[PDB]
Each structure stands twice: as structure tokens, then as C-alpha cells.
From a paper:
Mira is a key adaptor protein that directs several cell fate determinants to basal cortex during the asymmetric division of Drosophila NB. Mira is a multi-domain scaffold protein that concentrates at the basal cortex along with its cargos during mitosis of Drosophila NB asymmetric division. The Stau family of dsRNA-binding proteins exerts a conserved function in mRNA transport, localization and translational control from Drosophila to mammals. However, both dsRBDs 2 and 5 are required for the anchoring of bicoid mRNA, whereas dsRBD5 also directs the actin-dependent localization of pros mRNA through interaction with Mira, pointing to other functional roles of dsRBDs 2 and 5 rather than RNA binding.
The complex structure was solved by single-wavelength anomalous dispersion using Se–Met derivatives at 2.5 Å resolution. The structure revealed that the complex forms a 2:2 heterotetrameric architecture, in which two Stau dsRBD5s interact symmetrically with the N-terminal end of the Mira coiled-coil homodimer. In accord with the previous small-angle X-ray scattering-based structure prediction, two Mira514–595 fragments, each made up of a single contiguous α-helix, dimerize in a parallel manner to form an elongated ‘rod-like' structure. Interestingly, the Mira coiled-coil dimer is slightly asymmetric, with one curved helix A wrapping around the other approximately straight one A′. The two α-helices of Mira514–595 form a quite tight supercoil with an average interhelical distance ∼5.8 Å, a value that is much lower than expected for a canonical coiled-coil (∼9.6 Å). The interesting feature of the Mira514–595/Stau dsRBD5 complex structure is that Stau dsRBD5 binds to Mira through the exposed face of its β-sheet, a mode that has never been observed in any other dsRBDs before this study. Arg532Mira from helix A forms an extensive hydrogen bond network with the side chain of His976Stau, and main chain carbonyls of Pro972Stau and Glu978Stau at L2 of dsRBD5. In agreement with the solved crystal structure, SEC and ITC experiments showed that mutations on Mira (L529E, M530E and R532A) or Stau (Y971K, H994E and I982A) from the Mira–Stau packing interface disrupted or severely impaired the interaction between Mira514–595 and dsRBD5. In line with the complex structure, L557EMira mutation was also found to disrupt the Mira–Stau interaction, demonstrating that the dimer assembly of Mira CBD is crucial for Stau dsRBD5 binding.
Numbering used by the authors:
A (entry chain H): 949 to 972, 978 to 1018
B (entry chain C): 502 to 588
C (entry chain A): 503 to 589
D (entry chain F): 948 to 1018
């Protein structure tokens, strides 16, 4: 039910690839093979929190297109 | 004249994508600088501790030579006292 | 015809993005490798600091063994000379 | 000299756009890296690699000039 889960639901639904890259705050870069493609980031106190912050920023961007 | 709405829209979406992406690039640049620095740091720390360990091994060997001399001295003293007891 | 302009704008933004993403790419690859590098050095530092701690303990054992030898030699000598003076 | 880096600066003074170099040493990497930013419209973030900071800077400058001409 998390942000990450929404984005993955969305990528499975609209057929674009989503790749998380985690960096030890924690940093997550999330790449989206959309048109045009997106590269978002998120930070957090854990890999999970940063991944969901990234996913959230991706969902915001996707909605603004 | 409708083509201008779609023009300005596409432009808007590319501008958004670019802004977002540049913010990511900035984050990446800072993180790469810091990580590279850390690699330098841990590399230097590693040499520092290997060198310190090396000085410590030499101290150990010097003290070991000290102790070796002492053992021979003690043994000769023992041989003297015990030979004298036997006489 | 506003569409020549549309497709041109699209073209220049596509070039800009493609280029920029190539930059993002080299930043990410280098940052990944740097991070791996840092973990490796972290682990190596740990092993050598362990080894140094161990050696420091050994030095303390050898140092104690040496003072024990000095006291034993002093006492042994005192004994040998007391028995020499007795005889 | 007369270099790539000099041509780009000529161009930035001429056309009033900002250009910023960022250099990364070889370190434990396979080469030197330079990122160069161009405050153009749309802005550009180019890079260059080399066996020296000088080389990576010229490679970057060159990358920047190619992209500017292709627009």
C-alpha cells in the first residue's frame, strides 16, 4: 500500500520499467523508463524511507505531465 | 493556434523533466565528491594503521631480544647456584 | 507549420535530456564503484585494527615475562652469592 | 590555446551564458572526470573524461560545443 507499491502498480499497469538504486541519510535514485524518462530521488533515515520518498517524488512528477 | 497550446504544453513537460533531472544530477555530484573523499580517507587510515602495526612489531622484536638475553643470564645464574648446591 | 516549430523544440529537448542522462549515468556508475571501494577499505581497516589489538596484548605478555625474568635473575644472583658467602 | 576550453569561454562571454567546471580526480576510478554546466536555454550538463584534469576539461568543453552546435 506504500508509495513504492503505488509506483510499481503504476509501472506494471502502464508498462514502464522502474529501477531503484540505493546509496548509503540514505539516498535513493529511481529511474523510470517513461516518455520522456524520469530520474527522481528521495532521501530518508533508512533505505525503505528513502525509496518511498523517491517513489513519491516520481508519482508527483508523473501526475504533473 | 491550437498547436500553440500543445507546443507550450510539451515545452512545459520537458522543462519539468529537466528541472527534476538536474536536481538529481546535483545530488549525485555532491554524493560522488563525498564518497571519493571517503575512499581517500579510508585508504590513508589503512596505511596509517599498517605502519603503526609495523613499528609495534619492531618494538616487540627488540623486547624479545631483551628477554632472550635475560633468559640466558638467568639460566647461567641457575646453573651456578645449583652446581654450588651440589658441592 | 507551427508543427515544424513543435518538432524542433521536441528535438532540442530530447538532445538536452539524452546528453544530461549520459552525464547522470557516469555519475551513478562512479558513485556505485566508489561506495563498493569504501566498504572494502572499511573491512580491511577492521581486520588490521584487530590484528594490531592482538599484537598490543602480546607485547604486554612479553613485557610481563621480561620483568619476571629480571626479578628471577636478581633473586637467583642473591642466592648464589649468599651460598658463596656461606661456604 | 586556443583550446576547447578557451573556445567555450569565448562563446560564453560572447553570448552571456554561465559556464561552470567541476573536476573529479582519478582517485580509485579508471580516469579523470569533468562535469561542465552551461546556463543556456535549455541548460546543459555535459561531461568529459581524461588521463588528466586538463584533458577531461577539454573533453567536456568539446562535448558542450558539439551539443550547442546541434541545437
Amino acid at each position: 500500500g506504500s508509495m513504492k507499491e503505488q509506483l510499481l502498480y503504476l509501472s506494471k499497469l502502464l508498462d514502464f520499467e522502474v529501477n531503484f538504486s540505493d546509496y548509503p541519510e540514505f539516498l535513493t535514485i529511481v529511474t523510470l523508463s517513461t516518455h520522456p524518462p524520469q530520474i527522481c530521488h528521495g532521501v530518508g533515515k533508512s533505505s525503505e524511507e528513502s525509496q518511498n520518498d523517491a517513489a513519491s517524488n516520481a508519482l508527483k512528477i508523473l501526475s504533473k505531465l | 493556434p491550437g498547436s500553440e497550446f500543445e507546443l507550450r504544453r510539451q515545452a512545459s513537460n520537458y522543462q519539468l523533466t529537466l528541472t527534476n533531472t538536474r536536481a538529481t544530477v546535483n545530488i549525485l555530484m555532491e554524493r560522488l565528491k563525498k564518497s571519493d573523499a571517503d575512499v581517500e580517507q579510508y585508504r590513508a587510515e589503512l596505511e596509517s594503521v599498517q605502519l603503526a602495526k609495523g613499528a609495534l612489531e619492531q618494538s616487540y622484536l627488540v623486547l624479545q631480544a631483551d628477554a632472550e638475553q635475560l633468559r640466558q643470564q638467568l639460566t647461567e645464574s641457575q646453573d651456578a647456584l645449583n652446581a654450588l648446591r651440589s658441592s
